């Protein structure tokens, strides 16, 4: 019937990609990548950013259907594109060690830059590191990581929110005064700290729970979320600054966040700027 009806995903029974209508409204063939040139990039070849991606594509909705989601490609690749041009490298990990799952329906197919960057890291996205291995060997006081990046997309709502491994990564980042970068639903991962109040008083921007309750009306999702990461984040001490979305980014000490799928470019510029200043002395 309607272009607003969820689109069946052939690989999983009772699973759906966003409706044709929502895709035309919420995705585009090109990204708005801009100002990604850095005249004095980091050239030390040491500092890297740890990327923690979603290893699951199917998210259970309140009505039993699966939302065929995963990490948002634009939210993931724009920040990475800027950091790449800034001279930084990446290690990609998932909780299980299984492939990072992208919402391919949001990939800007006509964007040469974004597609070129994915291809650059495709072997890592497809065969990522298992977070437990990273925790056991690449963190600590002498880590080569200058920060951690947790991309958005509803895929970040699975596993990451209550993973004891993610908790360890976040505590490490805070303990070693490392950058924590995330946007949209990515901050849901912060809930991994459980009852630990290490994020008390922090200000961030994140996708509004209010909007998650509305997007299903046009078939962006085949149902509604079974919980609210925003209210949960507020429960552990976070202050959510944005009522709506406009690509706004915020920096609270070393916590850098973006508000939605509109903040990829701005977050990339902010992170690149922040990390570059950090490496210079």
Q: Whole-number minimum distance, CB 60 to a second copy, in Å?
A: 6
What angle is formed at CA 174 by the lines to CA 71 and CA 251, rounded to 5 degrees?
65
Cα 189 to Cα 94: distance, rounded to the nearest angstrom: 12
Q: Binds 165, which of Ca ion, a second copy, none (CB < 5 to 8 A, cut-off by type)?
A: none
Q: Beta strand 89-94 with 129-130: parallel, antiparallel or unpaired?
A: parallel
Q: Binds 178, which of Ca ion, a second copy, none (CB < 5 to 8 A, cut-off by type)?
A: none
Q: Binds 158, which of Ca ion, a second copy, none (CB < 5 to 8 A, cut-off by type)?
A: a second copy
Of the two residues 148 and 158, which places its CB atom closer to a second copy in the complex?
158
Q: Are 147 and 275 in contact (CB under 8 A)?
A: yes
Q: Which of 52, 93, 184, 255 is catalytic?
A: 184
Q: Whole-number minimum distance, CB 192 to a second copy, in Å?
A: 14
Is 120 catalytic? The answer is no
Residues found near a second copy in the complex (CB under 8 A): 9-13, 17, 55-58, 60, 66, 68, 95-99, 101-102, 104, 107, 126-127, 158-159
Q: Whole-number minimum distance, CB 241 to a second copy, in Å?
A: 32
Of the two residues 219 and 261, which places its CB atom closer to Ca ion in the complex?
261
Q: Binds 227, which of Ca ion, a second copy, none (CB < 5 to 8 A, cut-off by type)?
A: none
Q: Whole-number minimum distance, CB 53 to a second copy, in Å?
A: 13
In angstroms, how far is the first alpha carbon of the chain from the final one? 61
CA 162 to each of CA 22, 145, 229, 244, 277: distance values in angstroms, whole numbers, following the listed order: 30, 23, 12, 26, 33
Q: Beta strand 66-68 with 58-60: parallel, antiparallel or unpaired?
A: antiparallel
Find the DSSP H helices in 39-130. 73-85, 112-126
Catalytic residues: 184
């Amino acid at each position: 019937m309607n272009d607003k009806h969820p689109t069946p995903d052939p690989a999983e029974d009772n699973a759906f990609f966003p409706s044709a209508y929502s895709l035309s409204q919420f995705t585009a063939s090109k990204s708005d990548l801009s100002g990604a040139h850095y005249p004095t990039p980091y050239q030390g070849g040491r500092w890297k950013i740890l990327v923690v991606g979603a290893d699951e594509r199917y998210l259970m909705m309140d009505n039993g259907t699966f939302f065929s989601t995963g990490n948002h490609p634009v939210e993931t690749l724009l920040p990475m594109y800027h950091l790449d041009k800034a001279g930084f490298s990446f290690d990609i990990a998932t909780l299980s060690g299984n492939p990072v799952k992208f919402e391919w329906w949001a990939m800007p197919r006509e964007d040469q830059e974004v597609n070129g960057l994915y291809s650059k890291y495709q072997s890592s996205f497809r065969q990522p590191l298992k977070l437990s291995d990273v925790i056991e060997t690449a963190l600590g006081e002498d880590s080569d990581y200058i920060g951690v990046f947790i991309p958005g997309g509803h895929g970040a709502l699975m596993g990451l929110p209550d993973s004891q491994e993610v908790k360890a990564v976040l505590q490490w980042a805070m303990k070693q005064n490392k950058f924590i970068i995330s946007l949209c639903h990515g901050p849901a991962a912060f809930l991994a700290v459980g009852d630990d109040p290490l994020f008390a008083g922090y200000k961030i921007v994140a996708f509004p729970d209010e909007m998650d309750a509305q997007t299903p009306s046009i078939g962006y999702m085949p149902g509604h979320l079974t919980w609210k990461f925003g209210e949960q984040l507020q429960a552990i001490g976070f202050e959510l600054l944005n009522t709506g979305i406009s690509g706004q980014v915020f920096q609270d000490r070393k916590m850098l966040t973006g508000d939605s799928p509109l903040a990829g470019n701005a977050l990339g510029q902010l992170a690149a700027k922040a990390l570059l200043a950090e490496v210079e002395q």
